Amino acid sequence: GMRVYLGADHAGYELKQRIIEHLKQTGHEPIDCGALRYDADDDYPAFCIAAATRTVADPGSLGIVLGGSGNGEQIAANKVPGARCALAWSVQTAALAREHNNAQLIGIGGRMHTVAEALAIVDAFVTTPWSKAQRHQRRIDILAEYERTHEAPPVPG
Amino acid sequence: SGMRVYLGADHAGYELKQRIIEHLKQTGHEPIDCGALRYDADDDYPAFCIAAATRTVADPGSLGIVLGGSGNGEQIAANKVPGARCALAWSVQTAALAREHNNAQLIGIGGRMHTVAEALAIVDAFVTTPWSKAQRHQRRIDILAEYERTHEAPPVP
Numbered sequence: 001g002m003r004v005y006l007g008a009d010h011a012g013y014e015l016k017q018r019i020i021e022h023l024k025q026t027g028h029e030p031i032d033c034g035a036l037r038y039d040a041d042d043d044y045p046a047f048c049i050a051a052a053t054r055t056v057a058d059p060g061s062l063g064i065v066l067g068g069s070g071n072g073e074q075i076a077a078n079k080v081p082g083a084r085c086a087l088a089w090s091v092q093t094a095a096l097a098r099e100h101n102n103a104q105l106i107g108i109g110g111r112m113h114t115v116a117e118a119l120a121i122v123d124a125f126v127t128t129p130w131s132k133a134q135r136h137q138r139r140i141d142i143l144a145e146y147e148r149t150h151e152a153p154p155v156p157g
Numbered sequence: 158s159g160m161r162v163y164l165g166a167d168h169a170g171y172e173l174k175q176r177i178i179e180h181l182k183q184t185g186h187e188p189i190d191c192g193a194l195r196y197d198a199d200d201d202y203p204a205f206c207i208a209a210a211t212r213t214v215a216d217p218g219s220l221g222i223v224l225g226g227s228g229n230g231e232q233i234a235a236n237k238v239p240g241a242r243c244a245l246a247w248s249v250q251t252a253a254l255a256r257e258h259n260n261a262q263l264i265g266i267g268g269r270m271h272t273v274a275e276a277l278a279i280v281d282a283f284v285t286t287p288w289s290k291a292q293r294h295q296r297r298i299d300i301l302a303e304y305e306r307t308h309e310a311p312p313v314p
């Protein structure tokens with residue numbers, strides 16, 4: 001069982017509440033970063049930055065950010081130092097996010113999937129192991145070093 | 158109408174990148190190849206994605222496309238570049254919303270996830286859909302930009 005930080009604007013809110021209940025039922029500890037109620041006009045970035053910041057700060061935890069499409073949400077998460085947020089739109093991409101990218105977070109577009117599809121995405125995300133494979137780690141290290149220095153790494157050739 | 162487009166890809170997105178480059182030329186746009194310049198099965202996506210994102214941000218009004226197996230590590234990398242907003246485009250709808258809602262200057266595309274026809278449809282939506290300039294979207298982009306400026310997490314409501 002794992003702590004999972006969730007953040008969502010109004011467009012992801014209802015799906016977020018469903019995911020929280022699903023995660024409880026499957027033995028996880030969901031932590032709601034907000035929104036705590038439906039507010040049709042609310043703004044995703046704060047919730048996504050909160051979820052990403054909290055996830056990165058909490059070893060072994062994962063996070064999930066939801067909105068209409070999930071794309072603004074993952075962009076916002078990805079601005080957090082050390083955060084790696086994939087956009088998960090299928091079981092395959094949720095799984096690869098963990099296996100290849102060691103993503104601590106995924107974005108999900110609430111308007112893009114049925115609830116069943118979304119929960120299947122969440123299941124793949126929370127159950128797929130990070131591979132620890134050499135080449136994937138190398139690539140993550142390159143990105144982390146760019147985050148640290150903003151020195152663009154040279155392109156081969 | 159015609160857009161300048163910076164492209165970057167690792168080996169997993171290489172063939173698709175070359176097809177997109179030709180497609181963009183054929184449809185009246187100006188593709189600029191940031192690499193990879195040949196197929197290297199072992200090469201590492203971050204450098205190419207950071208290059209494309211960095212050049213896109215430095216050339217306002219340009220767009221960028223980053224490609225790899227899933228596009229997710231690729232967009233994560235792009236999103237580390239100051240001022241870059243890179244959506245994951247997995248459909249015509251999400252490519253369009255990336256422009257409309259997120260004003261994303263870049264998209265990631267997974268070369269292992271789509272047929273070429275499907276990929277080119279995604280590209281067409283991305284390079285043709287206008288940024289909406291709607292108040293609420295500009296507000297959210299500005300909130301994210303301020304967080305990127307200071308790395309001070311904005312309070313949730």
Ligand SMILES: O=C[C@H](O)[C@H](O)[C@H](O)COP(=O)(O)O
Binds near residue numbers: 066069073
């Ligand atoms: O990437 C952003 C996500 O799709 C948002 O939930 C969406 O933009 C919200 O739009 P609206 O409900 O304010 O029209």
Ligand SMILES: O=C[C@H](O)[C@H](O)[C@H](O)COP(=O)(O)O
Binds near residue numbers: 101135169170230
């Ligand atoms: O996000 C990363 C992208 O999916 C890469 O193209 C992928 O990791 C390459 O996988 P492999 O060809 O090294 O197995």
